[PDB]
Scaffold this active site. Sequence first.
Site, PDB file in Angstrom:
ATOM      1  N   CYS A   1       0.645  13.868  -7.772  1.00 26.54           N
ATOM      2  CA  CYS A   1      -0.042  12.961  -8.644  1.00 26.54           C
ATOM      3  C   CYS A   1      -1.165  12.104  -8.025  1.00 26.54           C
ATOM      4  CB  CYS A   1       1.012  12.071  -9.279  1.00 26.54           C
ATOM      5  SG  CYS A   1       0.446  10.831 -10.515  1.00 26.54           S
TER       6      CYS A   1
ATOM      7  N   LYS B   1       0.839  -1.193   0.000  1.00 25.82           N
ATOM      8  CA  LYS B   1       0.000   0.000   0.000  1.00 25.82           C
ATOM      9  C   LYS B   1       0.876   1.245   0.000  1.00 25.82           C
ATOM     10  CE  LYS B   1      -4.121   2.143   1.775  1.00 25.82           C
ATOM     11  NZ  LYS B   1      -4.924   2.612   2.934  1.00 25.82           N
TER      12      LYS B   1
ATOM     13  N   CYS C   1       3.346  15.280  -9.675  1.00 29.64           N
ATOM     14  CA  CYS C   1       2.660  15.234 -10.966  1.00 29.64           C
ATOM     15  C   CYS C   1       3.622  15.779 -12.010  1.00 29.64           C
ATOM     16  CB  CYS C   1       1.391  16.079 -10.908  1.00 29.64           C
ATOM     17  SG  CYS C   1       0.598  16.480 -12.495  1.00 29.64           S
TER      18      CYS C   1
HETATM   19  S1  FES Z   1      -1.963  13.596 -11.640  1.00 27.61           S
HETATM   20 FE1  FES Z   1      -0.513  11.991 -12.242  1.00 27.61          FE
HETATM   21  S2  FES Z   1       1.000  13.003 -13.505  1.00 27.61           S
HETATM   22 FE2  FES Z   1      -0.524  14.595 -13.062  1.00 27.61          FE
END
Ligand code: FES
Lengths: 66, 66
Positions: free
Chosen positions: A32, A14, A43
């Site tokens: 992300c 996890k 991200c």
């Molecule tokens: S939310 Fe995953 S790369 Fe932008």
Amino acid sequence: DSLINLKIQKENPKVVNEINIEDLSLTKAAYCRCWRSKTFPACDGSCNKHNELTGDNVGPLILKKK
Amino acid sequence: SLINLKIQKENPKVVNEINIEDLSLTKAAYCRCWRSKTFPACDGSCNKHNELTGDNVGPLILKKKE
Ligand code: FES
Ligand code: FES
């Protein structure tokens, strides 16, 4: 429902990431939520590629300080 | 194949911004699985997702302290 994360840290049962808010270097940081970033947990815009291919609409969490 | 099945599918790209000063707890889990009923917060729906789909996703935990 099926797998979301295909390749990130698959030896980890996890994947949880902790962020110490007090130490946020940037004024705004993107994290992300598609499990496609090559710089996960950050991200890197891979979300946009996923969304274009699949018709999805996923996107990052943006953390803002000050 | 989609990551987000249900959340704001009318929204071209779901992006949530968090103002760090509004976090009052020492920890706040934010969802990276798109299954939370309290999205963008994590409500632990990640666990049953992982159990049922063989995945290993989990939240981003924003930690704050004096
Ligand atoms: S939310 Fe995953 S790369 Fe932008
Ligand atoms: S409910 Fe989605 S990461 Fe916990």
